[PDB]
Swiss-Prot record, chains A, B, D:
Homodimer; Homohexamer when secreted. Interacts with envelope protein E. Disulfide bonds join 4-15, 55-120, 156-200, 257-306, 268-290, 289-293. This is Non-structural protein 1. It is a peripheral membrane protein. Glycans are attached at residue 184. Residues 1-329 are extracellular. N-glycosylated. The excreted form is glycosylated and this is required for efficient secretion of the protein from infected cells. It is found in: Secreted; Host endoplasmic reticulum membrane. Involved in immune evasion, pathogenesis and viral replication. Once cleaved off the polyprotein, is targeted to three destinations: the viral replication cycle, the plasma membrane and the extracellular compartment. Essential for viral replication. Required for formation of the replication complex and recruitment of other non-structural proteins to the ER-derived membrane structures. Excreted as a hexameric lipoparticle that plays a role against host immune response. Antagonizing the complement function. Binds to the host macrophages and dendritic cells. It comes from the Viruses.
Swiss-Prot record, chain C:
Residues 1-352 are extracellular. It is found in: Secreted; Host endoplasmic reticulum membrane. It comes from Dengue virus type 4 (strain Philippines/H241/1956) (DENV-4). The chain holds residues 775 to 1126 of 3387 of the full protein. N-glycosylated. The excreted form is glycosylated and this is required for efficient secretion of the protein from infected cells. Signal peptide: none annotated. Glycans are attached at residues 130, 207. It is a peripheral membrane protein. This is Non-structural protein 1. Involved in immune evasion, pathogenesis and viral replication. Once cleaved off the polyprotein, is targeted to three destinations: the viral replication cycle, the plasma membrane and the extracellular compartment. Essential for viral replication. Required for formation of the replication complex and recruitment of other non-structural proteins to the ER-derived membrane structures. Excreted as a hexameric lipoparticle that plays a role against host immune response. Antagonizing the complement function. Binds to the host macrophages and dendritic cells. Disrupts the host endothelial glycocalyx layer of host pulmonary microvascular endothelial cells, inducing degradation of sialic acid and shedding of heparan sulfate proteoglycans. NS1 induces expression of sialidases, heparanase, and activates cathepsin L, which activates heparanase via enzymatic cleavage. These effects are probably linked to the endothelial hyperpermeability observed in severe dengue disease. Disulfide bonds join 4-15, 55-143, 179-223, 280-329, 291-313, 312-316.
Length: 329, 329, 352, 329
């Protein structure tokens, strides 16, 4: 990586060569774009899946849904000019990028993404069947060429991932993940910006300090592409398995949501699904408590409000008439 | 940080904010002038440790040898001002930075560094009792402040280390280490640029893919501050315990020494100590073979000549009239 | 700010911190998420303004129209739940963003609404009623611009992003005719200057003199450019500003071109514009002493469909001024036809 | 200028083309390669000026003084090679870069800079006769080409300065000036970094808000290359014509120097020359009083001490036994 960067304290310009790990979620200008391989190959793969009995596909990344939406008309043209009665419908991403149990091999209605339905579940939908072939060119926005995978795997594509550590600051980056960490008497996670919630597994070749990791202590659960590292850990908290993951984009941070107070009281209820501060009628709950936390509290900053972690419980409301996370069990 | 990665061939510019790992080994332009916390505190430390049986100290990094050489005169002046009979001589480090067995807890001739002697063995010498507390400012020189450690540990200081991975390239950087990994159908080490040979342990908080690692497969042994990971690995080889580590400055790369050939055969003996291509007489050995290595063979590039790994043994020349590795087997 | 630039013609990367002014030619965003002060405060202000005789509002920029189109449904829901006979209709922008002569003063004793923020509630389109509160749209007679509010909001905090951008607005303390400065900029370095904005990008350069070079307008505002964000703002004559101050042209001497005066009756009725200096295809412009005086700006192609090729000028300087719109080519206020009168031609709809 | 930049959050990555105003005062550049017209032309112009009656020159900027010091030896050599009895002597600047009343037209001692004496009256020296032609680079070979002016001008050269404003932060930049302004309920100056004190005039083509400006309200006077702007203003202060401008390198900031307090009260003496906090002996005065200023007070942070503005007078000690500004009233 030829080039160099200035420090965060104004002017400490170190210049040389090495490996650069750069934030991608917090950008105004798009920096990466997905490009398919050929309209002819994708149409043949879709027809082969239709013969096999595949209803549709489930996008793995929010940058892949755009790529699938951008070629729907061309796929429809190719399918129509073949004597085949088939229609490809491009949906939109809403909630968790759920995983299917099917894949697409290299060469009615075919529904792509879309809201979860019962006519054809994710049981027979194709998921995680693209691999990065190489990187293209472009002054500011570089494009990425995709290819069909050889087989099937639950591990995310490792050609789009990063991980770095320097002095007392680590990071586990991705195209839609940015998980930070720091050291203050302990190595623990401090913030995590997510523009999506995927499901494939984080590979262990791109993780820092991935030994002795206990699966029940990972703040971002392994089922939601959380790194299998000890930097993915916060003291006093366990895995947030029933958090507000249905929101889609999240902003994990440590602090207090505006207008509320959290106190450590042993006379508190056990862990349960994450609750929103504002009631469904707009009323705010301003008194919360938790058993054995570590201040400051853990909050998720979604689009519809500020949530709390799985261990913090209210003291003002009965929790019967409060909106909770939609993650089932 | 904040900076850009450029590609002069073509047009590319990847800017943003994140973590940037820069090659600090290939600098050849600056020497940091270390400044301890208190000259009176240090003199008290050596004076207190003198009666405890500590004959001297041994450096852990090639940078603190410089500060000891710089401040030995001021230490002697302070000792003279204190009206005490003690003399301190700052020697030079040549070869492996040996490991002591004592420590200077905070409050004849006291030998700092230098060659091993029977009257002052390293088993009565202190080792690894300073740590970096803060960083300085400046381009010509940076003031690195060092303070006494609270406890005693065999792990190297983590405030100077870093590690990164992106796409298909990894690196385990340091102030005197530069290990690079790359993926070609498998992750394996490809080159290393060591300007020193330490003895402390690489921290597991700064390693990538440190799960399921066997000590009998690390190309750079953990006794010489080799990262405890699976990127530090090469197919067909094992731990290079008896390699040419006494040279000090090293250069690990895979290839052929000029005018030599290595062939796959079952007619050679087992692995042994590292050997030079050129003999004590001055001639050059051309016929080499390995039992189960992989081409290109492991090659060490020191000041004296071009060495081989432990698994490459000569086929024509006799091992009894050539120089072996001075490290104990 | 922090960041740095590359010079392809050669090798150099000067990298540091300062103030960086960048255009919007490489940036795109999908969704805006506006957030005015409160659903109950804004609805109360609108109701009071309607009771005072203000029968509508008129947008001051192009983001304001998007905001109103987005929040109209919740405004209607609040007004219906309050049991008041009033419906809000949000229209489009066609041409110049005209200016009204009223304002919404901050209310007292606002309406009753449980939520304190926009969009985080379930609503529905209640009904239509006999009284309307028009927001923008085509100009009519029942709501002239004299009884329409204008320029009564200003942003306070904002955040941009690739997928979602957030902007917070608030009521203005008083009434003013000056555009909001919290999203515009201006810079100069060496022999190049720029007067940027969210919809304006004016470039000036030096070649023996300082004069305007090219301007790209995606909107035609009407508020004044603040003088705190203006370079070389001393000794400027209002009759020499190429982009008149009535259309948010900076009160600068960089906003100037030799041989031309203010273009009052230019083709501003188009909205999107691209001012540049050159010759439109298939036409030739000369300088003569017997040409006609300046008048309404004209188009190269007549209404029938055929173009004219002989144009002349009296006192301008080559290359001629040129307006590039969706309709076609429009010459400057000084270039006049020679081989065909302006009669068989379409002229600027701006009133003269 | 094509490039990409972030904001003061680390977010909102915008890549594109525009105008980039970058801090050049705090650049830590140590190598400069100035290229004047020609050794044959400068010597001829100097000889003609000396024949006309000029006895020396006065540098307009620090870089010009560096250039003259670098090229003085070659100028002397080329002047001697032609058989002319003249020697060029290059000195160093101390304080304000004073201005001369002559110029060099295109084609026994000749002093450059240095102290002030009767050998060369300040009205018999050349000043502001060179202008920039081409620009330099960005790693270590910044090469600026100079060229003779056509006529005599007292305005600073515009090829090297800039100015920018964005939201609520402005800046007036140069190679030796860095003046910052901000909006906190009103537009007023915030801080200024001055590594030199010039005497030419800031051109009004590179000035923001240069209308309705009253000459007596500019914090940095018009005679010291202060911008003719309304951003160059502080509420409660007037022109600092008799400030500590004789220091040279300076740092204008608002606050209280350590160990002193300022209180606004109606009883106080009128304005006057600026004076240091500490007296000649070394006693630090602790009590000061304004008359109509606004807190925090204006202070100049020089290389010898912390000064105050013309409005902050001392009350606990007479000004007779204190060091005052050396600039003539």
């Amino acid at each position: 990586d030829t080039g160099c960067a200035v420090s965060w304290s104004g002017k400490e310009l170190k210049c040389g060569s090495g490996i650069f790990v750069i934030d991608n979620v917090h950008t105004w200008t798009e920096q990466y774009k997905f490009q398919p391989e050929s309209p002819a190959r994708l149409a043949s793969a879709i027809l082969n899946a239709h013969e096999d009995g595949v209803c549709g596909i489930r996008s793995t990344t929010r940058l892949e849904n755009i790529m699938w939406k951008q070629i729907t008309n061309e796929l429809n043209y190719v399918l129509w000019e073949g004597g085949h009665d088939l229609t490809v419908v491009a949906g939109d991403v809403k909630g968790v990028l759920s995983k299917g149990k099917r894949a697409l091999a290299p060469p009615s209605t075919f529904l792509i993404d879309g809201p979860d339905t019962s006519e054809c579940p994710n049981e027979r939908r194709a998921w995680n069947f693209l691999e990065v072939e190489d990187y293209g060119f472009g002054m500011f926005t570089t494009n990425i060429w995709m290819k069909f995978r050889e087989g099937s795997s639950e591990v995310c594509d490792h050609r789009l991932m990063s991980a770095a550590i320097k002095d007392q600051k680590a990071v586990h980056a991705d195209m839609g993940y940015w998980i930070e960490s720091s050291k203050n008497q302990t190595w623990q996670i401090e913030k995590a910006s997510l523009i999506e919630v995927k499901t494939c597994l984080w590979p262990k070749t791109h993780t820092l300090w991935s030994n002795g990791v206990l699966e029940s202590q990972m703040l971002i659960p392994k089922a939601y592409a959380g790194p299998f590292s000890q930097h993915n850990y916060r003291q006093g908290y366990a895995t947030q398995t029933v958090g507000p993951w249905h929101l889609g984009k999240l902003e994990i941070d440590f602090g207090e949501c505006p207008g509320t107070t959290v106190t450590i009281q042993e006379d508190c209820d056990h862990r349960g699904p994450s609750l929103r501060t504002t009631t469904a009628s707009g009323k705010l709950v301003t008194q919360w408590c938790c058993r054995s936390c570590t201040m400051p509290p853990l909050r998720f900053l979604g689009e519809d409000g500020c949530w709390y972690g799985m261990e913090i419980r209210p003291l003002s409301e009965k929790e019967e008439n409060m909106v909770k996370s939609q993650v089932s069990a």
